């Protein structure tokens with residue numbers, strides 16, 4: 661079978677903690693009354709939620725109410741425990757309250773309000789400095805949750821709220837997040853297609869916090885190169901082919917050999933053979949103002965087949981790309 665793997669950082673943070681911290685199944689959830697909140701308008705509608713802007717009628721403050729479509733009860737409890745554990749963390753969305761509507765009995769999570777700037781509007785107004793500043797802000801959130809023994813597992817532009825006027829960033833949507841336990845086999849059907857690490861695509865279940873670092877690398881490539889998404893797969897099998905077209909097929913085989921991964925028979929038939937491309941080949945007239953040798957070196961140390969070889973969030977924070985900022 662496959663060779664075991666563990667995170668290079670915060671490996672045993674949950675092992676040395678009591679049951680209370682990570683056993684979300686035994687966590688007691690106390691649901692308040694939604695009558696303190698008046699729903700104002702719909703902000704977004706996710707995979708299994710309806711997000712509304714709301715007013716807390718007890719203090720006239722704006723909040724956000726995420727109304728959960730009652731899926732597996734264990735999943736709601738997992739998201740609550742993680743948000744409660746990370747509450748107050750740098751650039752982490754703050755869970756202010758947990759409520760239930762008296763008549764519907766539907767569960768709902770109450771969050772601090774974020775005045776989100778449009779992805780297309782932000783994409784056309786960001787400078788080299790803005791990208792470095794916001795990348796550093798995301799790194800603070802990731803180093804923090806990883807230190808708290810949690811992997812986000814759905815890192816992407818849509819899960820990062822930015823109030824550009826106030827230069828305020830929040831990592832949201834902790835519904836796929838999970839407690840890291842060294843040597844544990846996790847579900848590989850996590851993260852959004854374009855952001856899936858090669859470990860998920862090759863069905864390597866013993867992954868860690870390093871999955872988040874790959875996703876972060878995909879977001880950085882899309883920003884500096886102005887190609888969204890950067891790895892544009894049409895399905896999960898094709899997603900690995902898009903990565904292989906850039907990173908090369910040689911290093912993919914070295915990766916599967918190192919971890920003794922049993923690659924699906926179908927892959928050899930669609931992967932083909934591809935050379936490793938130089939990051940500079942993605943530089944053009946429309947994006948050259950966002951590219952620098954430091955950005956390319958940083959991106960290269962994030963987007964690597966081998967999850968263990970990828971930089972950790974704290975290592976990434978020390979990289980020369982962040983010196984100016």
Ligand SMILES: Nc1ncnc2c1ncn2[C@@H]1O[C@H](COP(=O)(O)OP(=O)(O)O)[C@@H](O)[C@H]1O
Pocket residue numbers: 703704705706707708709710711724726753771772773774775776818819821832833834835
């Ligand atoms: N704190 C927030 N402030 C503002 N908008 C938010 C906030 N949290 C969520 N949203 C909006 O709601 C959408 C869906 O919420 P999300 O937490 O990502 O749920 P899901 O797991 O269903 O995708 C987001 O993409 C965003 O537009």
Ligand SMILES: C[NH2+]Cc1ccc(-c2ccccc2)c(Cl)c1
Pocket residue numbers: 776777778779782783786790791792794795798816817818820821822879880883
């Ligand atoms: C407002 N939600 C979309 C969005 C847009 C841009 C970024 C982004 C900006 C600079 C560097 C890296 C990513 C992010 Cl995280 C999210």
Ligand SMILES: [Mg+2]
Pocket residue numbers: 706818819833
């Ligand atoms: Mg989401």
